[PDB]
Design a protein around this ligand. Structure first.
Ligand SMILES: C=C1CN=c2nc(N)[nH]c(=O)c2=N1
Ligand SMILES: C=C1CN=c2nc(N)[nH]c(=O)c2=N1
Ligand SMILES: Nc1ccc(C(=O)O)cc1
Ligand SMILES: Nc1ccc(C(=O)O)cc1
Ligand SMILES: [Cl-]
Ligand SMILES: [Cl-]
Ligand SMILES: [Cl-]
Ligand SMILES: [Cl-]
Ligand SMILES: [Cl-]
Ligand SMILES: [Cl-]
Ligand SMILES: [Cl-]
Ligand SMILES: [Cl-]
Ligand SMILES: [Cl-]
Ligand SMILES: [Cl-]
Ligand SMILES: [Mg+2]
Ligand SMILES: [Mg+2]
Lengths: 264, 264
């Protein structure tokens, strides 16, 4: 199987790798259209970041950013994912009939589970060692993190299914980078063992490594020179059977996947 | 095993990807020093190109370009390879005591074999469908090219060994891109089957794909946007056990190899 590409379109001011570049509505639409041209299957819209240096974005402001971009992309028939962890914003996305809701908190509020069940959109259920809120910088034990993540998925999937969410709507994301720990060994272990998530839960898995900190620690590179380590980790994940890849440089990943497919 | 990196330093005017950038002596030395900083094990110096659009460079001019660069790099203890197919230039490299002579013609002139035997430098024996001269654009049958290449290596190795060249000095390069054919299928087959060269001859193999045309035909990219397809093919070759990789972007390849090593 070939991994599907989520194209990151950050409509923020403080995204760790491209904050402020696509804050304007038309520039965000133009960026999304370019990523689709580059081979993106889904456009992941994020009007609020979640890196350790992020600043809280209000719900009204977040919906204001997403509203005209969703409208323009839905007009073109583009599959839309929204990277939001705020239940009121997620409820707005259900009304807009987007294809995915991408929650770094993994839908931890059962009060809205009945509303999620009535929708038909797919749910990207992400695990993090923080569980609630944006990423932080904390050292973790890789084996213990993988074990707790496996238990977290099992309980959260069961809670959503018990509330009426169809199981096949759930896509699992183990988290990566600071969502797993400040030491890169935890991210490395998850990258090596994520097929065990597909096997245990029989659900698709998304891998999101693009430009993240742990790549820079292994190679000694800042965020602007992280294309090569990103591509190395993304094609490792593709070769290992990742169902979705969430990336910034869609064109480079697509070209790299075309070469890997021709050689494999 | 980890592939060794040959850093390309073109002291030419018409190299297909970076011609004219490092024609100046000090700029070529500065580029070579940067590539060593980026992780290059060997610096491959080429004062004359061999792409299909190349222009013949005189022997006197070629030696004039290489002479001060070799001197500066030898002062720093840098391992030097010289990409030259002219016997008089190769004789100059033997006098300079460089570590490698990289011949796209695979040393086809037995008149100089006795001189090659007395030297201690390693010999990069490259195969091409043209055999003599620079690359051309010609469509070829992949299976027939691989078969003829295997026979070419067998006869050329035996001729060099019979003349006194120690067998362990020979590094095999199957050729790539236009050296194999204008259709990318021939390059793809050689990339998939080059371990058979190591097995049959018990010699090291060099893979040189960086920015070459066949990558652009598979992905639909010009020479300036070929980093991602280059990295995809280079780490495929590394994972398959290539002993040497000849590349332009040493820093990107090194960073990519560090990630692949940490994940493998
Ligand atoms: C930087 C971020 C923001 N949103 C994400 N969303 C998902 N699903 N996975 C990530 O790793 C992730 N990284
Ligand atoms: C573009 C070039 C010039 N010199 C080379 N040298 C070797 N050994 N192999 C190549 O593929 C090669 N490509
Ligand atoms: N949202 C996130 C953005 C970046 C990182 C990281 O660099 O590890 C983690 C989370
Ligand atoms: N010397 C060479 C340079 C480039 C190519 C190629 O693009 O195929 C082939 C030979
Ligand atoms: Cl960007
Ligand atoms: Cl709701
Ligand atoms: Cl800590
Ligand atoms: Cl739960
Ligand atoms: Cl850097
Ligand atoms: Cl360059
Ligand atoms: Cl000689
Ligand atoms: Cl032809
Ligand atoms: Cl011969
Ligand atoms: Cl292009
Ligand atoms: Mg974001
Ligand atoms: Mg050259």
């Amino acid at each position: 199987g070939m991994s599907k590409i989520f194209g990151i379109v950050n409509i923020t001011t403080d995204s760790f790798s491209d904050g402020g570049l696509y804050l304007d509505t038309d520039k965000a639409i133009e960026h999304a259209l370019h990523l689709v041209e580059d081979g993106a299957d889904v456009i992941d819209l994020g009007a609020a970041s979640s890196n350790p240096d992020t600043t809280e974005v209000g719900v009204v402001e977040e919906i204001k950013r997403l509203k005209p971009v969703i409208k323009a992309l839905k007009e073109k028939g583009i599959s839309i994912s929204v990277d939001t962890f705020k239940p009121e914003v997620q409820s707005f996305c259900i009304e807009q009939k987007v294809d995915f809701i991408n929650d770094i908190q993994g839908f931890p509020y059962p009060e809205i589970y009945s509303g999620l069940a009535k929708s038909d959109c797919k749910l990207v259920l992400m695990h993090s060692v923080q569980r609630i809120g944006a990423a932080t910088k904390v050292e973790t034990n890789p084996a213990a993190v993988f074990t707790s993540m496996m238990e977290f998925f099992k309980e959260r999937i069961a809670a959503l299914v018990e509330a009426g969410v169809k199981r096949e709507r759930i896509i699992l994301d183990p988290g990566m980078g600071f969502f797993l720990g400040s030491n890169p060994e935890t991210s490395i272990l998850v990258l090596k063992r994520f097929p065990e998530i597909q096997e245990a839960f029989n659900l698709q898995v998304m891998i999101a490594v693009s430009r993240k900190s742990f790549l820079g620690k292994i190679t000694g590179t800042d965020v602007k020179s992280r294309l090569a380590p990103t591509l190395a980790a993304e094609m490792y994940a593709y070769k290992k059977g990742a169902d979705y890849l969430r990336t910034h440089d869609v064109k480079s990943l697509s070209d790299a996947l075309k070469i890997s497919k021709a050689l494999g």
